[PDB]
Design an enzyme around this catalytic site. Structure first.
Site, PDB file in Angstrom:
ATOM      1  N   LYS A  69      66.610  71.276  53.260  1.00 36.67           N
ATOM      2  CA  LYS A  69      66.794  70.287  52.209  1.00 36.67           C
ATOM      3  C   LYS A  69      66.093  70.715  50.903  1.00 36.67           C
ATOM      4  O   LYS A  69      66.692  70.609  49.824  1.00 36.67           O
ATOM      5  CB  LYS A  69      66.765  68.781  52.635  1.00 36.67           C
ATOM      6  CG  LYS A  69      68.005  68.317  53.457  1.00 36.67           C
ATOM      7  CD  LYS A  69      67.826  67.003  54.225  1.00 36.67           C
ATOM      8  CE  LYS A  69      67.560  67.126  55.723  1.00 36.67           C
ATOM      9  NZ  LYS A  69      68.777  67.235  56.554  1.00 36.67           N
ATOM     10  N   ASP A 128      49.321  32.306  48.840  1.00 35.02           N
ATOM     11  CA  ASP A 128      48.817  32.459  50.207  1.00 35.02           C
ATOM     12  C   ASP A 128      47.380  32.072  50.281  1.00 35.02           C
ATOM     13  O   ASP A 128      46.583  32.454  49.463  1.00 35.02           O
ATOM     14  CB  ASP A 128      48.899  33.899  50.769  1.00 35.02           C
ATOM     15  CG  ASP A 128      50.244  34.570  50.968  1.00 35.02           C
ATOM     16  OD1 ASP A 128      51.347  34.029  50.854  1.00 35.02           O
ATOM     17  OD2 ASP A 128      50.076  35.806  51.378  1.00 35.02           O
ATOM     18  N   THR A 139      67.525  43.056  51.256  1.00 39.25           N
ATOM     19  CA  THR A 139      66.133  43.263  51.584  1.00 39.25           C
ATOM     20  C   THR A 139      65.161  42.610  50.565  1.00 39.25           C
ATOM     21  O   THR A 139      64.068  42.157  50.913  1.00 39.25           O
ATOM     22  CB  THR A 139      65.931  44.727  51.965  1.00 39.25           C
ATOM     23  OG1 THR A 139      66.117  44.897  53.348  1.00 39.25           O
ATOM     24  CG2 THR A 139      64.612  45.290  51.533  1.00 39.25           C
TER      25      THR A 139
HETATM   26 CS   LIG Z   1      61.970  41.282  51.926  1.00 37.24          CS
END
Ligand SMILES: [Cs+]
Ligand SMILES: [Cs+]
EC number: 2.7.7.7
Length: 327
Positions: A64, A248, A93
């Site tokens: 590669k 959080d 995602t």
């Molecule tokens: Cs995510």
DNA sequence: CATTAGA
DNA sequence: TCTAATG
């Protein structure tokens, strides 16, 4: 850092793909140690064969490097970069809640776009629902101007409920940062530590408080020591509302705060480095404690911490203001 | 690297 | 229970 650039970049691009678009944990794991080693190497790799002498560097990867070195590209890379399916996963995602596993499935089903996801809000769980809801806001950076705003309310109620509480907004925020991605409150109480078998309420109490007033607006997840949610600054006297922000909160035994605080404050490097030093200094640092090293190889026996200071004094260093904990 | 949802 | 997702 730059002589080996293209390589490591391409290589990581390669790794990331096996992991997500495919399920090749291994090939993925492959590309990464390689990309790791090729990165430490002090000279300009001039050819495969050269790299090839490296650990992790095999024939596949090497081959590669050539193509890349030879022509400024790589087909496989140009092929994937193109590939709609793979794109799709890359994209899905971003939605908070969605990982690779879900993304593949969603795709397999036909859900590739933002709207696709809407049309099927049903196939999604709470998290992903929220994430879907706040896709924009979630992606947006948090101005320090704002963090200050938030940190203000947060210490306020904390105090309101119980005055024995101690909160600290950790992270790049802690460290000066012009902006942040989300907020991170570290929480503790005296009545909570190592043994003293919990008081879930301690977390609960506060969550409720912050809600009661409209600061918290969703719950991604709430456990007995780690709340994970969404917040919003009171959109003023109109014309300007605030974006939804990830927040959080986490409970911590009063007896492990500071290391925890140190730790979460970063940076990743300041840490590693301070950490590396405690080693020489005859110590062991980790997110929760600081143990003295015993020659036999290792040792234990947590040393008592009351402030960021103790940890420092310990490894006999210079107290570093968070501002300059940069590295 | 540990905690939470979930199925 | 295991397995995914966050951090
Ligand atoms: Cs995510
Ligand atoms: Cs090798």
């Amino acid at each position: 850092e730059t002589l080996n650039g293209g390589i490591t970049d391409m290589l990581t691009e390669l790794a990331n793909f096996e992991k997500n678009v495919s399920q090749a944990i291994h090939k993925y794991n492959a590309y990464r140690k390689a990309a790791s080693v090729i990165a430490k190497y002090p000279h300009k790799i001039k050819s495969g064969a050269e790299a090839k002498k490296l650990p992790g560097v095999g024939t596949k990867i090497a081959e590669k490097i050539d193509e890349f070195l030879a022509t400024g590209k790589l087909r496989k890379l140009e092929k994937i970069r193109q590939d709609d399916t793979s794109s799709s996963i890359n994209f899905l995602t971003r939605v908070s809640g969605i990982g690779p596993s879900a993304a593949r499935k969603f795709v397999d089903e036909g859900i590739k776009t933002l709207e696709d996801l809407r049309k099927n809000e049903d196939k999604l769980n709470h998290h992903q629902r929220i994430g879907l809801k706040y896709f924009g806001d979630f992606e947006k950076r948090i101005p320090r101007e704002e963090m200050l705003q938030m940190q203000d309310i947060v210490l306020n109620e904390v105090k309101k409920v119980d005055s024995e509480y101690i909160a600290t907004v950790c992270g790049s925020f802690r460290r000066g940062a012009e902006s942040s991605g989300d907020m991170d409150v570290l929480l503790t109480h005296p009545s909570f530590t190592s043994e003293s078998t919990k008081q879930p309420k301690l977390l609960h109490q506060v969550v409720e408080q912050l809600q009661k007033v409209h600061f918290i607006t969703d719950t991604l997840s709430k456990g007995e020591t780690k709340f994970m949610g969404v917040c919003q600054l009171p959109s003023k006297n109109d014309e300007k509302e605030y974006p939804h922000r990830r927040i959080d909160i986490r409970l911590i035994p009063k007896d492990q705060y500071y290391c925890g605080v140190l730790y979460f404050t970063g940076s990743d490097i300041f840490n590693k480095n301070m950490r590396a030093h405690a080693l020489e200094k005859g110590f062991t640092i980790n997110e929760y404690t600081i143990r003295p090293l015993g020659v036999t190889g290792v040792a234990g026996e947590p040393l008592p911490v009351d402030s960021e200071k103790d940890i420092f004094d310990y490894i006999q260093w210079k107290y570093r203001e968070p501002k300059d904990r940069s590295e």
